[PDB]
Design a protein around this nucleic acid. Structure first.
Lengths: 156, 156
DNA sequence: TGACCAGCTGGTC
DNA sequence: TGACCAGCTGGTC
């Protein structure tokens, strides 16, 4: 075993408390799908993740759904979407507003909200390519952080 | 914001320390790819993560590469593999031994190792099915926890 | 920018 | 059991 295993031990009880708080708010594993980050966004905005949801989607007090994305800017400048993008995937996106959270590794820096009207530029670009390439799925095309910051409304 | 936000604030400094520890050992984000749990396995076994790596693969002091998997037994019974299983993926898998970690919550219970000869039962089965189905990828077939415990060597 | 490419996993019946 | 159903992201230039 490596000598740092000792540090891991002292820190664990605090990590367990955090996982307990995540469970209280519907997140089963803080270590997958940006789980520990998702909790911060939820508590700041007041949004909720429902049991039986399909991904990182959440809802407000009135029941309106939102797609939640996150990015680590110390590594990349474009938000991930889907590994196999096509018109069926885009249809799931079309009618809901998106919430984009920006991080420096682990420290949250800002949160922006984009409406359907401000995402149509990308939905159209993706559908156009899909046809051109003979109905070939697109491998994870990105949404630039600058586009998000300029077109969206900052909420944090 | 949800009133529980104040709680996260007390916990945060400890969480940041854990991410600092992971960064020192080659892991950039404790909240994706079972990051926080992968670090625990690396510290227990003495394995290290090769920079420039594809995914969660690790190396020993002899330079032998390994594929590492993880599971939470209190809610899942089979280990994930690949979303698009095919002959190219199978040939990669056949070259290295695998390390399997078992958790109950975020509490680690055990770790097992299997050699290529111990997994051929599945590789042979999957390859035959790919050709037989008319060259169609298999979507994430699972390896049973019972199979791992009966055909592997217990390491922890 | 956006072109090419990749791995980490959960669920049901 | 195995055969299917799904999403979360990152690499080079």
């Amino acid at each position: 075993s490596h000598p740092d295993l000792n540090k891991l031990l002292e820190l664990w009880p605090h990590i367990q408390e955090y996982q307990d708080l995540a469970l209280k708010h519907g997140i089963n594993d803080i270590f997958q799908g940006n789980g520990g980050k998702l909790l911060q966004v939820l508590l700041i905005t007041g949004l909720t993740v429902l049991p039986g949801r399909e991904g990182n989607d959440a809802v407000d007090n009135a029941g309106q759904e939102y797609e939640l994305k996150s990015i680590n800017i110390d590594l990349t400048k474009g938000f991930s979407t889907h590994h196999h993008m096509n018109p069926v995937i885009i249809a799931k996106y079309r009618q809901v507003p998106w919430i984009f959270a920006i991080y420096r590794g682990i420290a949250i820096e800002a949160i922006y909200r984009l409406e359907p009207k401000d995402l149509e530029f990308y939905y159209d670009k993706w559908e156009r390519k899909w046809y051109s390439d003979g109905h070939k799925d697109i491998n994870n095309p990105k949404i630039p952080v600058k586009y998000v910051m300029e077109h969206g409304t900052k909420i944090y």
